[PDB]
Design a protein around this ligand. Sequence first.
Ligand SMILES: [Zn+2]
Length: 265
Amino acid sequence: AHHWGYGKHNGPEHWHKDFPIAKGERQSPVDIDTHTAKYDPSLKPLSVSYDQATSLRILNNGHTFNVEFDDSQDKAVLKGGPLDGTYRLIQFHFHWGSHDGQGSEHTVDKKKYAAELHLVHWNTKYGDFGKAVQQPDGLAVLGIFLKVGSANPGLQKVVDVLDSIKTKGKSADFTNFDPRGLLPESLDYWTYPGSLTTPPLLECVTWIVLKEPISVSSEQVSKFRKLNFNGFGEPEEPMVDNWRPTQPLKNRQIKASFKHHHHHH
Ligand SMILES: [Zn+2]
């Protein structure tokens, strides 16, 4: 069984014992130092085509909630940017804090956001997600920060169903959710090679982290915190602070698709 979680006894500092790649050379998340994450003019615009996305289900898996998609065809796909080929959307999930001052996995010049959205996509050349996660170019994860402010209409359908999946293992039908409602205006981004941010921590991810956050109301993020890590019939453990701290960049380069205000050129 899995021991790992986010507590003091089983959290990120313990993960390397079962998953020694936790101390690897390409671990995520990372701090994005915007001065050293240089503009790369060879980076193409991202193509996020979600108009035909087909959501299926929403699930509390004991460490986040996932919205799952039908990935049997090239409907919802990510391409362009740093990517070679076509990556199919399989699910999205969030990381959030116990309070509005923390929650994101990536940081920008050490700044944390209240939450972070991960849209997970796999490379169609590999046939399915399980095959893709075994390869360095297998996954592309689009990371989007959530900044507390005005309520986000694009998030409300998700928040409204969370009361039906309060405990680990619970799921609910969740059709016709349009993930276009979770995208900011700008598709400017940073990109680097990294890992899954939960066990098994495989170094199979091209990370694409958007510059522009999307909004979330304080009330909306509070509803994330009403979920529980525990299963039905166990003492309640609120699902909060389900984020891994930032990991050493080591020899990697973060590239920017745009000129940041910290770049003279
Ligand atoms: Zn994640």
